[PDB]
Paper text:
The circadian clock of the cyanobacterium Synechococcus elongatus can be reconstituted in vitro by three proteins, KaiA, KaiB and KaiC. Homo-hexameric KaiC displays kinase, phosphatase and ATPase activities; KaiA enhances KaiC phosphorylation and KaiB antagonizes KaiA. The crystal structure of KaiC from S. elongatus revealed a hexamer in the shape of a double doughnut with approximate dimensions 100×100 Å, whereby the N-terminal CI and C-terminal CII halves of subunits are joined by a 15-amino acid linker. Two phosphorylation sites (P-sites), T432 and S431 that are both located in the CII half were identified in KaiC.
To analyze the phosphorylation patterns of KaiC P-site mutants and to visualize potential conformational variations in the vicinity of bound ATP and residues 432 and 431 at hexamer subunit interfaces, we determined crystal structures of the S. elongatus KaiC single mutants T432A (TSa), S431A (TaT), S431D (TdT), and T426N (nST) and the double mutants T426A/T432A (aSa) and S431A/T432E (Tae). b KaiC mutations xyz or mutants KaiCxyz are sequentially shown in order of sites x = 426, y = 431, and z = 432 where the wild-type residue is in upper case and mutated residues are shown in lower case, i.e. Tsa or KaiCTSa, where the residue at position 426 is T, the residue at position 431 is S, and the residue at position 432 is mutated to A. The structures of the TdT, nST and aSa mutants provide further support for the conclusion that T432 is the principal phosphorylation site because it lies closest to the γ-phosphate. The combined structural data expose subtle changes in the orientations of the H423-I433 loop region harboring phosphorylated residues relative to the γ-phosphate of ATP compared with the structure of wt-KaiC.
Residue numbers in the entry:
A (entry chain F): 14 to 519
B (entry chain A): 372 to 519
C (entry chain A): 224 to 297
D (entry chain B): 446 to 504
């Protein structure tokens, strides 16, 4: 590695990437954030991982939270800090005030702390130190200039002692000054900012490394979630473009279609289905997933529009029994309102479910369902995410999209999730003789030849029957074509008179 | 209730933002769905004749059955038309039927089969030699069959 | 925040009625709605036909049209 | 025919039945004189009609 500073890994999923390797050793990192953002957790995970993964004893200095509490809360993620404190790998140095105290003590204690800490580091041979809520101590009665001095002194002794430190700090605004006294920013070697942005009644936590003296790192904010396993970061911009690409075809669940694509979809390929509401994207989705189960391959179906019941009532009415696909442990249906969370959360859930089930085919019925509310870029970031993780996972995928306007839609996606897609399946309503007929079209396929016609298709109990193209028609796409005819009655099987048999015999 | 009907979701969309609305729609739509209740929701599309979209708000995804009414300009006259646009579990009739309104209610008639661009609101009458070919004078090949 | 455990994030609308606080976790509602094949008339037989046998009991029906078309009638 | 003529129409009535025709009307010193419907025109509503002048059934 061509970086000038030595780093230590947090082993926190996603952080080490963003910081190009973890936290610089022998130096100190300010993790500052508003209330409830994940500061303690970060610093706690920082010591835990260092103990569980590298046998590095750790020191935890707490100024407000009680040692029992730090231990009570960490059980949220299944961590037995007590067993570690016991094995003498972790030492919690309690410097919190007393529920019956006085007033005045934040400088010589800053010298008594330094010495207390040095003692603990030396005794437990500690390599990592976390200092939670340094801010709370000057929160006795201090000004910027006093804080800068005391922070520096502390940090400077730590550096000398060799310790790799993490220091927590608070702030009141999500986008204003980095820390309270607008002084901590500049004294630290590194600065990580944790945010919890409100925006339209939802909450979005992000993690940003503002500075790392010595090496580079990923710039800007990064979405993340706190789960039962601690912080979990998605470096959506560290996602490279080196997905493997095969010439392997697979079926779509529809014979005629597969022909239309010049022999089925590519295994390694993102599929896009768009048409007006009611055209039938959801049918191809059902058909796509059932065929993965008809070949004894797993497949997930994330539904964001239909309940788990309906999906089955409708699916059955088209033939295909979803009840069985579920029992044979071959098809897994998810289901969720896009509103039940934020993209970050949703993208993870998807990622998760993809691991606990090793699919070979995934279908997201209605990207445009997830499109609800979210800004366009926040949506595209998601589409890059799902479309990306899948491409590098060899997982074939079918994505659905509902164009806000039946007939007359001048564009594939109102979102432009076009260039992100390899194959595009376009459905639409054609107005012929006072009636609404369907029309399916393989708009684009990158490695294949695919059929160029805009066929007509019927939906029966059997499923999708792909007929022929409205040759003798112009302005097709318009929604309401004009019937021009150089023929129609031309051969095909004229021979008038009695051509049929009726129910009796033939 | 076994059935519920809110005449004009579009009347509740007044003022309120769009996401606040979509949140309302998700609300009384699912609550009805789990309670087993059947509900009919009304929507007046902001523009007569030319409506390129079911709902201006785009709730045509949280719905199961879409019924569509629309004026059709016919010979200097404003006639109605009805079309079951989409039905998730059934087969439903694909015809854009015309219909009158009397004391008796709504008499659904036929489809305008000899027109073009009906969804627009200003169709284009186009029989001009219907389904009978230019051979309405049947050429004359039929001049041998009947004799003396 | 809730040091120690999980919790739904963000805002959630609530009303204060004659029965205290009433919160609606519109984001908590799950997609587990029961769905059958049972039909139900509309009050319009011709319609019921076009819908291949009436509206399903378990279903949401939306009527859209220009002013004066007749949604309030259906 | 290169002329700005009017047309009145009862678009909707919640109670009664009202007329469904788009009627041409003139204005004079006597007031509104509602004439007839452009029965033989297309896209009236649009505002720039197109007389069909259909050649009947052409015999
Ligand atoms: N098991 C868990 N699953 C999901 N979220 C959790 C879990 N445990 C805790 N959390 C979340 O993490 C947060 C805990 O924050 P944390 O204790 O790490 O420090 P903080 O919020 O940065 O600072 P402060 O000490 O001011 O609260 C809670 O607000 C909560 O939402
Ligand atoms: N059993 C059936 N028999 C005949 N036609 C059916 C049957 N089930 C569904 N259909 C037809 O298929 C359509 C259902 O649409 P589908 O579930 O395929 O998804 P979509 O149109 O892409 O999206 P959305 O359902 O959200 O509008 C109906 O509008 C209807 O015309
Ligand atoms: N007794 C009647 N006879 C004939 N036509 C009637 C009668 N009553 C109402 N109508 C017609 O039906 C229409 C009434 O519309 P309706 O009350 O059904 O609701 P809407 O069109 O959905 O919504 P809104 O009334 O707000 O415009 C009138 O515009 C009119 O043309
Ligand atoms: Mg659907
Ligand atoms: Mg009304």
């Amino acid at each position: 590695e061509h970086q000038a500073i030595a780093k230590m890994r947090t082993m926190i999923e996603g952080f080490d990437d963003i910081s190009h390797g973890g936290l610089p050793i022998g130096r100190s990192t300010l993790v500052s954030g508003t209330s409830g953002t994940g500061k303690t957790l970060f610093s706690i995970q920082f010591l835990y991982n260092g103990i569980i993964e590298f046998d590095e004893p750790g020191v935890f200095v707490t100024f407000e939270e009680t040692p029992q509490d730090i231990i009570k809360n960490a059980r949220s993620f299944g961590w037995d800090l007590a067993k570690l404190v016991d094995e003498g790998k972790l030492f919690i140095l309690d410097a919190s005030p007393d529920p019956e105290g006085q007033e005045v003590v934040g400088g010589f204690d800053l010298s008594a702390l330094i010495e207390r800490i040095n003692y603990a580091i030396q005794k437990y041979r500690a390599r990592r130190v976390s200092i939670d809520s340094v801010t709370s101590v000057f929160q006795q009665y201090d000004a910027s200039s006093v804080v800068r001095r005391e922070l520096f002194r502390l940090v400077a002794r730590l550096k000398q002692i060799g310790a790799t430190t993490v220091m927590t700090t608070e702030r009141i605004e999500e986008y204003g000054p980095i820390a309270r006294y607008g002084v901590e920013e500049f004294v630290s070697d590194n600065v990580v900012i944790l945010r919890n942005v409100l925006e339209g009644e939802r909450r979005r936590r992000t993690l940003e490394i503002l500075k790392l003296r010595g090496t580079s790192h990923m710039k800007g904010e990064y979405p993340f979630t706190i789960t039962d396993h601690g912080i979990n970061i998605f470096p959506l911009g560290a996602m490279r473009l080196t997905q493997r690409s095969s010439n392997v075809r697979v079926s779509s669940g529809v014979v005629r279609l597969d022909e239309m694509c010049g022999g089925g979809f590519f295994k390694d390929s993102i599929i896009l289905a768009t048409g007006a509401t009611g055209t039938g994207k959801t049918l191809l989705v059902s058909r796509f997933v059932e065929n993965a189960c008809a070949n004894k391959e797993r497949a997930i179906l994330f539904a964001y529009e239909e309940s788990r019941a309906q999906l089955l009532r409708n699916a059955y009415s088209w033939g295909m029994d979803f009840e069985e696909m579920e029992r044979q442990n071959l098809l897994k249906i998810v289901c969720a309102y896009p509103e039940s969370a934020g993209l970050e959360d949703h993208l993870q859930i998807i990622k998760s479910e993809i691991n606990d089930f090793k699919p070979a085919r995934i279908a997201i019925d209605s990207l445009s369902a997830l499109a609800r509310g979210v800004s366009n870029n926040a949506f595209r970031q998601f589409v890059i995410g799902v479309t990306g993780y899948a491409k590098q996972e060899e997982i074939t995928g079918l994505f659905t999209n509902t164009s806000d306007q039946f007939m007359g839609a001048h564009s594939i996606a109102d979102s432009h999730i076009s260039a992100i897609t390899d194959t595009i399946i376009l459905l639409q309503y054609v107005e012929i003789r006072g009636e609404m007929s369907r029309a399916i079209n393989v708009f684009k396929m990158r490695g294949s030849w695919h059929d160029k016609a805009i066929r007509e298709f019927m939906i029966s109990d059997k499923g999708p029957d792909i007929k022929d193209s409205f040759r003798n028609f112009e302005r097709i796409i318009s929604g309401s074509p004009t019937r021009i005819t150089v023929d129609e009655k031309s051969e095909l099987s004229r021979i008038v008179r009695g051509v049929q048999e009726k129910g009796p015999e033939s």
